[PDB]
Amino acid sequence: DLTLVAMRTGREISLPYPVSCGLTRTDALLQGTEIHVPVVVKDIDMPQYYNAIDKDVIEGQETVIKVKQLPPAMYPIYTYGINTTEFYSDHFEDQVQVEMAPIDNGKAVFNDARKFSKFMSIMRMMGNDVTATDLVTGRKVSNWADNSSGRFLYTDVKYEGQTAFLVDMDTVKARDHCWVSIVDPNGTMNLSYKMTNFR
Amino acid sequence: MAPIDNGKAVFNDARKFSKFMSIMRMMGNDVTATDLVTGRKVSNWADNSSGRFLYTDVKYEGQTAFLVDMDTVKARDHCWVSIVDPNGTMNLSYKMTNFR
Amino acid sequence: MSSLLNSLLPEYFKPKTNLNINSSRVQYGFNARIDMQYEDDSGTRKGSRPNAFMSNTVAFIGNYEGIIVDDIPILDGLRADIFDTHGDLDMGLVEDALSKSTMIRRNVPTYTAYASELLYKRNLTSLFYNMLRLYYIKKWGSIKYEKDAIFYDNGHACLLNRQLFPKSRDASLESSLSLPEAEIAMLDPGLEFPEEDVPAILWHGRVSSRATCILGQACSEFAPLAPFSIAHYSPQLTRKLFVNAPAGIEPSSGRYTHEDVKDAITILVSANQAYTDFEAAYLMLAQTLVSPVPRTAEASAWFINAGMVNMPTLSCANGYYPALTNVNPYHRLDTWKDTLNHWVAYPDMLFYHSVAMIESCYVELGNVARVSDSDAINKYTFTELSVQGRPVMNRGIIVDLTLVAMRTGREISLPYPVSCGLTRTDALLQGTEIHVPVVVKDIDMPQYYNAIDKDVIEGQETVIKVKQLPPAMYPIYTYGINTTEFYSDHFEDQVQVEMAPIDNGKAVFNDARKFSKFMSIMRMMGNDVTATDLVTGRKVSNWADNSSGRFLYTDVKYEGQTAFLVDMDTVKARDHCWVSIVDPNGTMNLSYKMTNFRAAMFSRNKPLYMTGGSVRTIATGNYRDAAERLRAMDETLRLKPFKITEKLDFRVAAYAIP
Amino acid sequence: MSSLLNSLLPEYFKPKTNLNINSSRVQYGFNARIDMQYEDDSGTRKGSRPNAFMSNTVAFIGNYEGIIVDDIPILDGLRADIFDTHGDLDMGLVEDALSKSTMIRRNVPTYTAYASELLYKRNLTSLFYNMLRLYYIKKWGSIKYEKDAIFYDNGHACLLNRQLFPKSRDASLESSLSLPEAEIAMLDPGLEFPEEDVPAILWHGRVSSRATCILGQACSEFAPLAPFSIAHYSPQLTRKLFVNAPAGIEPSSGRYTHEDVKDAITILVSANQAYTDFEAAYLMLAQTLVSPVPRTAEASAWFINAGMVNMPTLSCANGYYPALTNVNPYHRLDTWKDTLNHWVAYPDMLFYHSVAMIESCYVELGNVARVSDSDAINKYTFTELSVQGRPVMNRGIIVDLTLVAMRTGREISLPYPVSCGLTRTDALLQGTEIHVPVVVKDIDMPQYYNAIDKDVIEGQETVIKVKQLPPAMYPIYTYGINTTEFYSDHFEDQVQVEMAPIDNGKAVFNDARKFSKFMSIMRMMGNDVTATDLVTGRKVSNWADNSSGRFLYTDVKYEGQTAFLVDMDTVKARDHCWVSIVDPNGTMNLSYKMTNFRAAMFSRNKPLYMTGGSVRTIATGNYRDAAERLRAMDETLRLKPFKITEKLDFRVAAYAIP
């Protein structure tokens, strides 16, 4: 636990005695096997999003989700922009440039995985419900997959494969309050934000 | 060359796809790919008269990703250069002489 | 040792990750372009072979037997403090190390006494060997062995799988073995006296239901039905195996996927710090995995008698004393985790490393067989002069790595002098003619082969005599890295020979070297010439091997001195380029160039294509944060190469120190 | 002393830790390349044996009998304060030391009075000796002894195990002894007056359940059934043994392994500070671990009567005076812990140290038996002039160490002049005829051997009269380090036999020296020569051994005038790899050359290989440099970080060191 803190802050932690007592967290990681978490369903269109065991499930049924790679359990908040990585993208200033031509009728394909993550994340700050669909596999991902942090990490796809995300920009829905509207875009889009003060 | 997973190679970029099918045509390999957005089959052997591949043979303005069928690569016209299984970075250098 | 066997592959070839093997036979070669130029007294002629396929054939069939022997301990993974200023294990410091890392100090005198006896016999190489074999049985578990199939087939003679492998039946690779399960018990902490002749191993967290079944079957006896390379007979490793797991082990499931065996190996190595033990097992499997299909019928003499695989005894004392294994391990080389990191990333790469190793051994044994038994370096005393360490016995891997050094001409070095694996030089080290059983296909068989019965009928089972062992394989991957006169595997070469006077329709070739050069030219032009050996009275043919398009002098099948009567009237035209002429006149000059190499693999008379992505390099430098190279070149194994010095005889080979 | 016995081993010999002995007979030796030559007026005939095996057979059987004798006290261990300037117990500082301690005040005056007698009872050599024998009995317990087995056989004469050892039943070494346990009582600290004639020892913490069983059996009578060397007859050391352990003595377990005996020794030496006592016990066992199988039939005279082992009486008064032993002991030599530290690390090395000592002794007693009594340094007075100390009696280890000093040609130094162990020079000093029994095979025996009967039918039990004792072992480990002309153990040697054509093969050797070299070199060449003495009329054969393959002059079995007729048309070729003497004419010149040496061991007519780690030369400095180091790295858990680094993919993470 102390060696993980040393990696986060980026400093040298020193104790007087090399004592080895307390909780061990790295248990499910080192096993390197599939884990079967139980879930009770609410809607009927669940198993498209989550990697479920059943393909058709009536509401109020107890199902199982197959988790292979462990997603992050917490988002950095106290350690925000002290030792920044491009995965979490916990910057004060950030921008993304999605390049579209008028010949394309709103439909954009993200060949790159990095800028797809930043586009889907900044659109959620702006209070827009985007629903992308993978062209190779045929699954779907939604940027609204959290009600705490309000960011989109790439591990919300729940699948490691080839990157071909079709996003249709005439099915974008305004969900939250205090939001900027994308009524009908034409040409190159440039999104950007700035966090100024903290309380 | 894109990684061949089962018997299919995904070409996400547009420029790289144009260069790939342009090489395989000069070698003389009738390759058939599936456009993932539309769901229609493209073929590099569209025009027989002029022995070249233009990107307009896809017949879809806009952005897409192609799934190339690497198992069903037919051998129409074979010179000694002609290979079926590409591996890594493909280099083709040709010279045209003796016009009449 | 990945970096060693990876170097053997040719510079042009870089193989991809995956390879879907779906048969018990794989051809491997290259498609080269030959530009020949002919000149004689009549005039000049220029041609060009546009596509020429030179290939060997390798199979998954080889009769092997396991023996449990006592070998050296691998002292890698133990804490660095117990070792003194030199590279030696001091029992004075083991007492101190165990004392400081406990509150209960009553048990220190007892713990030290048992530890001193067990540390000098620690070896997990035999456990990893069986775990690796279980991985490949599950992965390639759809390969069929038919009993009434062909082994070698030329046209005159034939060998079936009934012969060479009696006591065999028709079975798939998954159907070959029905392994039992050894008792995987839990070591409760509190037991004071370690039970003797039972090893104890560490584990990360809870032992999975699937991990139990793998460890149970890895320790059990292997009893095959069909002869397979990766399912050979092995004795029982242990009866029990303790596992010091804080969380209790689960009962055995019964079934496991090939993916589950990777998870079992990765945990077992990481916990025990047994990285060098894995490197031994990796090299040990590279020898066994594949076996050569013989070039000619005489080259079946190698694979009659069952070669012995020396498996080290399974012992480990990490479970009892987990204080000795800590966060600061002792290692001799800084590149000591490369072999595992290579395998876990690219499992199917072992096939290419195995083909590269067995080729290098069986090519160089072609030369060692021809060495006269009245020189400094001969078949008996070639290993002993080469090695510069202190192993238990010059057996197993030491013999194989000595032949790789002689091939490449570079100094090979391992951290520990391990003597574990297959010994090939058994048929070689005996002054006796070997009786290869064969089947007669054509009535004129006794004229070609040295048969017992001089009159035969199509269908009869006879026996042929082999005195000197011919080469089993031709250089393909190791083509032109160092060229001997025997093989003549040049890129560019100018062959010059003087044609003998054609009296009636026959040309007498009294000299041995001139005869070899003549039939070598006529083969490259593509003329099937047949000559009569005057001493024996048997017919030789340059078209002996179709796969590799070259002529070796061992195709005559007569050690000693002779004169050949070549039939110049009956020169058939099998393959004709524009260079190809039938009537040579005076001094024959042939100058050829080989360019445009490209690797190709064939399986079941169709092209076998490589799948997956491109292999990115994984490799660690000589220093991580180490200041001074403390040489420590006393215990380390070193193998010195020998260079072949050609002499006038041509039939005899001779080695010298470079 | 580990140091002096280590130097006796050859330079080419590189020993390993473990030696898996599974029999009661070992043929230790070396493989050498002999280049023999026979020059003559007709021409030269060259030979070459690439692997020539020169061996000395060593067994685990030998009749010995222990007797309890009075020996000097060993004062190493007691605190350095009580000693004066000269180095003897200054009584007055003892009374001062006891007064300023944690002793009961009413016991001080009565205990001080006894000190004059009890403090000079310090000799634990007998206890350590018995505890070392229990270690090797349980380790090599599976070795067998058959009653009707062949002790010696040379074709003509045979000597069975029934002949030398009557009252002998066939049994395994483990099943030989049935040791009864002596009482191990706890010493009451509040005892009125110390009980003399009852030894009291110290212990660290609690006496374990197994330590009671080991100490109980160590201080008991050895009454064996089979005549084994490490299970010979010993009297009862003591009836009762006190142990000053505040933590109570647990009752006897009954069973124990060989590892538990090492635990018992290491606690006993550390508590009592008795390292010099252990060094004496180590050298004692080195003599009487293995006995040599006789080279010739008439060399069995050494092992007819049982040689007495001198075990010093068990006497220790540390239990009564705990204050006088502390962490600052008095020692003469600085390297006083080296012998124990060597044994704890490498227990099985004692086998090599044992054969080195007996081979050194029995070689020198060979060429000591061939000196006339009328001389300065002779049979009776070779020990007195060499010894420059003050031992009680010239017996045990003093006689064996002085013979080693003569062999190697160096000065052997011990800290205390202790006189305990086996005495070998018994049959020599008697100077009388010895009657060895023999069972005959052929009917023409009594011409060769000096037998009691002149005509004896096959299968009869006869007697041979041995007057002068022949050498029991040939020098092998000490080959060409201190060469004498008797053994003729040179690397290069030659002999010139001068004959004229007028003589029809018949040569008479007037000289005795060159007759020995001729007969010896002819046996290397594999020729069976049979000479006949002209004066007496007896016969000698060069083939009188199947181990070394040399001819010593003591094989004549008679001292007289030298006139040996050898007929050189009755020479028969016996062995393989031999040069032929078909028909010689003129002067003969024989010669050989030994070039290289490789250590080899044989057991049950199979190769016995050394396994385990590489044995080093342990010095006092190599451990105490790690004490100087102390691991001075302040024991503070400093965790260093890793900065994550992003690259093209971004899906997978990569950590850097800085």
Residue numbers in the entry:
A (entry chain A): 400 to 598
B (entry chain B): 499 to 598
C (entry chain B), D (entry chain A): 1 to 658
Text from the published report:
Totiviridae is a family of viruses with monopartite double-stranded RNA (dsRNA) genomes, which contain two open reading frames encoding the capsid protein and the RNA-dependent RNA-polymerase (RdRp). The capsid of L-BC is organized with icosahedral symmetry with two subunits of capsid protein, named A and B, forming the icosahedral asymmetric unit.
Two-dimensional classification of particle images from a purified L-BC virus sample identified 87% empty particles, 9% open particles, and 4% genome-containing virions. The structure of the empty particle was determined to a resolution of 2.9 Å, whereas those of open particles and virions to 10 and 3.7 Å, respectively. dProtein geometry was refined against the reconstruction of the empty particle. This indicates that during the sample preparation, the fraction of empty particles was enriched or the genome release was induced. The alpha-helical cores of L-BC A and B subunits have nearly identical structures, which can be superimposed with RMSD of 0.6 Å. The strand βU of the A1 subunit is inserted between the strands βJ and βK of the A2 subunit related by 72° counterclockwise rotation when looking from the inside of the particle.
